[PDB]
Amino acid sequence: SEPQDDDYLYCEMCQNFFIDSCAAHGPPTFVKDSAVDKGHPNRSALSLPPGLRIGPSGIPQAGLGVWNEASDLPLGLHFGPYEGRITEDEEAANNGYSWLITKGRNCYEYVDGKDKSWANWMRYVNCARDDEEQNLVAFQYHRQIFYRTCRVIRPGCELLVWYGDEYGQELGIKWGSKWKKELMA
Ligand SMILES: COc1cc(OC)cc(-c2noc(N3CCN(C)C4(CCN(c5ccnc(C)c5)CC4)C3)n2)c1
Ligand SMILES: C[S@@+](CC[C@H](N)C(=O)[O-])C[C@H]1O[C@@H](n2cnc3c(N)ncnc32)[C@H](O)[C@@H]1O
Ligand SMILES: [Zn+2]
């Protein structure tokens, strides 16, 4: 069939959707987690890619965060997938660590990263408070959540994430409507 709504990627330089590669800026770059057996008690921390550090958040009273150290993270760098336990119970939502996975017309599942032994490092990423400090966008791709860079992130800066059209409720309400197809060029 046609690509599903979550079979599209987004080119942050063109500001439009594409399928395999942007004709001007190429396929995106996916960063792989460090390998760790699922179920391992400090797996989340251990999965962290090289170049990043977990540490106290620059956002006050917000526990831990994830910070860039090695070098400049470029635009259209993709992290993930967000790992965790898969659940249809509503109890998982708003425990702090669950993302919505859209499975149909307003139909959902949760990926619950609370349990450290099942999650990955992305559970430690805090949310942006405003568009200006936001440097990651959470979105659904292949029934999974990824975070992509929407700014160049210099060494020393915290990864801060939020979402929009391509995630959760907005994605579920419009599901099947082929709306990204319209926004290619
Ligand atoms: C998988 O982790 C998740 C998933 C999630 O929602 C699906 C929310 C959170 C989450 N963690 O903390 C918070 N709150 C802190 C206080 N508070 C500031 C907010 C977070 C940021 N919000 C916005 C709104 C508009 N534009 C931007 C840039 C950000 C406002 C509510 C709520 N929310 C974490
Ligand atoms: C996915 S976690 C982020 C990692 C978390 N800081 C930790 O130490 O486990 C989400 C939780 O962190 C806290 N948090 C994340 N972003 C925040 C923000 N912008 N302001 C206040 N608290 C935040 C909230 O308690 C939320 O339930
Ligand atoms: Zn492009």
Residue numbers in the entry: 195 to 379
Article, verbatim:
PRDM (PRDI-BF1 and RIZ homology domain containing) proteins comprise a distinct branch of known and putative protein lysine methyltransferases (PKMTs). All PRDMs contain an N-terminal PR domain that shares the canonical SET domain methyltransferase fold, but with only 20–30% amino acid sequence identity. The human PRDM9 protein consists of an N-terminal Krüppel associated box (KRAB) domain, a nuclear localization signal, an SSXRD motif, a pre-SET zinc-knuckle motif preceding the PR domain, followed by one post-SET and a distal array of 13 zinc-finger motifs at the C-terminus. Biochemical characterization of PRDM9 catalytic activity with a histone peptide (residues 1–25 of H3) as an in vitro substrate indicated that PRDM9 is the most active histone methyltransferase characterized in vitro, trimethylating H3K4me2 with a kcat value of 18,000 ± 900 h−14.
Clear electron density for MRK-740 was located adjacent to the SAM-binding site and allowed unambiguous placement of the inhibitor molecule. Additionally, the pyridine ring of MRK-740 forms a π-stacking interaction with W356. The pyridine nitrogen is presumed to be protonated due to the basicity of the isolated 4-aminopyridine group (pKa = 9.2) and forms a long-range electrostatic interaction with the sidechain of Asp325. Significant additional interactions were observed between the adenosine moiety of SAM and the two central rings of MRK-740. Collectively, the extensive interaction surface between SAM and MRK-740 explains why we observed SAM-dependent inhibition. In the MRK-740-bound protein, the substrate recognition helix is flipped in the opposite direction, thereby preventing the enzymatically active conformation seen in the mouse structure.
